[PDB]
Enzyme design. Structure first.
Site, PDB file in Angstrom:
ATOM      1  N   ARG A  29     -33.801  22.942  -7.856  1.00 29.42           N
ATOM      2  CA  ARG A  29     -33.079  24.217  -7.821  1.00 29.42           C
ATOM      3  C   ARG A  29     -32.653  24.263  -9.249  1.00 29.42           C
ATOM      4  NH1 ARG A  29     -30.601  28.510  -8.754  1.00 29.42           N
ATOM      5  NH2 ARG A  29     -29.861  30.110  -7.412  1.00 29.42           N
ATOM      6  N   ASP A  34     -29.164  32.802 -11.290  1.00 26.91           N
ATOM      7  CA  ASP A  34     -29.611  33.330 -10.134  1.00 26.91           C
ATOM      8  C   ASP A  34     -30.415  34.453 -10.350  1.00 26.91           C
ATOM      9  OD1 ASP A  34     -29.759  33.603  -7.219  1.00 26.91           O
ATOM     10  OD2 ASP A  34     -28.046  35.084  -7.313  1.00 26.91           O
ATOM     11  N   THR A  35     -31.893  34.163  -9.704  1.00 30.66           N
ATOM     12  CA  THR A  35     -32.956  35.124  -9.967  1.00 30.66           C
ATOM     13  C   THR A  35     -32.999  36.172  -8.756  1.00 30.66           C
ATOM     14  OG1 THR A  35     -34.682  33.851  -8.957  1.00 30.66           O
ATOM     15  CG2 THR A  35     -34.221  33.527 -11.476  1.00 30.66           C
ATOM     16  N   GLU A  37     -34.458  37.572  -5.575  1.00 28.21           N
ATOM     17  CA  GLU A  37     -35.260  37.055  -4.423  1.00 28.21           C
ATOM     18  C   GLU A  37     -36.389  37.664  -4.222  1.00 28.21           C
ATOM     19  OE1 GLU A  37     -33.784  33.635  -3.426  1.00 28.21           O
ATOM     20  OE2 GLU A  37     -32.684  34.518  -5.233  1.00 28.21           O
ATOM     21  N   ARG A  81     -31.995  19.912  -2.400  1.00 29.05           N
ATOM     22  CA  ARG A  81     -32.737  20.111  -3.764  1.00 29.05           C
ATOM     23  C   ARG A  81     -31.914  19.544  -4.826  1.00 29.05           C
ATOM     24  NH1 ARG A  81     -32.651  26.673  -3.004  1.00 29.05           N
ATOM     25  NH2 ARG A  81     -30.481  26.133  -3.138  1.00 29.05           N
TER      26      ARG A  81
HETATM   27  C1  LIG Z   1     -27.605  26.688  -8.058  1.00 25.33           C
HETATM   28  C2  LIG Z   1     -27.012  26.423  -6.701  1.00 25.33           C
HETATM   29  C3  LIG Z   1     -27.220  26.777  -5.249  1.00 25.33           C
HETATM   30  N1  LIG Z   1     -26.565  26.187  -4.330  1.00 25.33           N
HETATM   31  C4  LIG Z   1     -26.580  26.784  -3.189  1.00 25.33           C
HETATM   32  C5  LIG Z   1     -25.745  28.173  -2.983  1.00 25.33           C
HETATM   33  C6  LIG Z   1     -26.359  28.480  -1.712  1.00 25.33           C
HETATM   34  O1  LIG Z   1     -25.936  28.286  -0.589  1.00 25.33           O
HETATM   35  P1  LIG Z   1     -26.341  29.431   0.766  1.00 25.33           P
HETATM   36  O2  LIG Z   1     -27.907  29.224   1.276  1.00 25.33           O
HETATM   37  O3  LIG Z   1     -25.239  29.023   1.701  1.00 25.33           O
HETATM   38  O4  LIG Z   1     -25.955  30.811   0.300  1.00 25.33           O
HETATM   39  C7  LIG Z   1     -27.839  28.449  -2.049  1.00 25.33           C
HETATM   40  C8  LIG Z   1     -28.127  29.455  -2.883  1.00 25.33           C
HETATM   41  O5  LIG Z   1     -29.733  29.233  -3.127  1.00 25.33           O
HETATM   42  P2  LIG Z   1     -31.002  30.019  -3.839  1.00 25.33           P
HETATM   43  O6  LIG Z   1     -30.428  31.154  -4.441  1.00 25.33           O
HETATM   44  O7  LIG Z   1     -32.056  29.241  -4.078  1.00 25.33           O
HETATM   45  O8  LIG Z   1     -31.257  31.014  -2.382  1.00 25.33           O
HETATM   46  O9  LIG Z   1     -27.778  27.419  -2.557  1.00 25.33           O
HETATM   47  C9  LIG Z   1     -25.601  25.178  -4.492  1.00 25.33           C
HETATM   48  O10 LIG Z   1     -25.237  24.639  -3.500  1.00 25.33           O
HETATM   49  N2  LIG Z   1     -25.376  24.801  -5.642  1.00 25.33           N
HETATM   50  C10 LIG Z   1     -26.065  25.201  -6.843  1.00 25.33           C
HETATM   51  O11 LIG Z   1     -25.969  24.517  -8.098  1.00 25.33           O
HETATM   52 CA   LIG Z   2     -31.225  33.372  -5.701  1.00 25.68          CA
END
Ligand SMILES: Cc1cn([C@H]2C[C@H](OP(=O)(O)O)[C@@H](COP(=O)(O)O)O2)c(=O)[nH]c1=O
Ligand SMILES: [Ca+2]
EC number: 3.1.31.1
Length: 135
Positions: A29, A34-35, A37, A81
Site C-alpha cells: 500500500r 489516498d486515491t 476508490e 500490506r
Molecule cells: C496508507 C495506510 C493505510 N492504513 C490503513 C488505514 C485504513 O484502515 P481501515 O480499513 O480501518 O479504514 C486502511 C485504508 O486502506 P485503503 O485506503 O487501501 O482502503 O488502511 C494504515 O494503517 N497505514 C497506512 O499507512
Molecule cells: Ca483509499
C-alpha cells in the site's frame, strides 16, 4: 531510508500494488496517499478512481525497474500490506499521483512520514493547478 528491488506481480488500484519482494509475493500500500476508490460497496467507485488506478498501473507496468522504500516506522499495516514509497524507474509513484491531482496526501502516521513535506508540496502544486481531484 534505502530502496530495494522488487518485481511487479499485479497493479491493484491507484494506491495498491502486488509485488514479489525478496522472493515473497506481497501486497504493498503506497505510503501517505489516498486515491479515490474503485472497488467497494461503501462509497462505491469514486470520481477519478479509474483514473488513479490506470495511472499507477501504467506507471508500474511500463517500468523496467521497480524499487520499494520503507519508512522509519512499521513496515506493514493491520491488513498485512507492506507500507512503502514505490519507485518506477526512479520516479516515486506516490508523488506522481499527488502531483497529478489523482491522490490526496493522507494517513500520515508518524514516524512513517519522511516524505510528507515533499508530497505536501506536490499536492499544493496540483491544487494550485486545479488538477483532477482539485478541478
Ligand atoms: C496508507 C495506510 C493505510 N492504513 C490503513 C488505514 C485504513 O484502515 P481501515 O480499513 O480501518 O479504514 C486502511 C485504508 O486502506 P485503503 O485506503 O487501501 O482502503 O488502511 C494504515 O494503517 N497505514 C497506512 O499507512
Ligand atoms: Ca483509499
Amino acid at each position: 531510508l534505502h530502496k530495494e528491488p522488487a518485481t511487479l506481480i499485479k497493479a491493484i488500484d491507484g494506491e495498491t500494488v502486488k509485488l514479489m519482494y525478496k522472493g515473497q509475493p506481497m501486497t504493498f500500500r503506497l505510503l501517505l496517499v489516498d486515491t479515490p476508490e474503485t472497488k467497494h460497496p461503501k462509497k462505491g467507485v469514486e470520481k477519478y478512481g479509474p483514473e488513479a488506478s490506470a495511472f499507477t498501473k501504467k506507471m508500474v507496468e511500463n517500468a523496467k525497474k521497480i524499487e520499494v522504500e520503507f519508512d522509519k516506522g512499521q513496515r506493514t499495516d493491520k491488513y498485512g500490506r507492506g507500507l512503502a514509497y514505490i519507485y518506477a524507474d526512479g520516479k516515486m509513484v506516490n508523488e506522481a499521483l499527488v502531483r497529478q491531482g489523482l491522490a490526496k496526501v493522507a494517513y500520515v502516521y508518524k514516524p512513517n512520514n519522511t516524505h510528507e513535506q515533499h508530497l505536501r508540496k506536490s499536492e499544493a502544486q496540483a491544487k494550485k493547478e486545479k488538477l483532477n481531484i482539485w478541478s
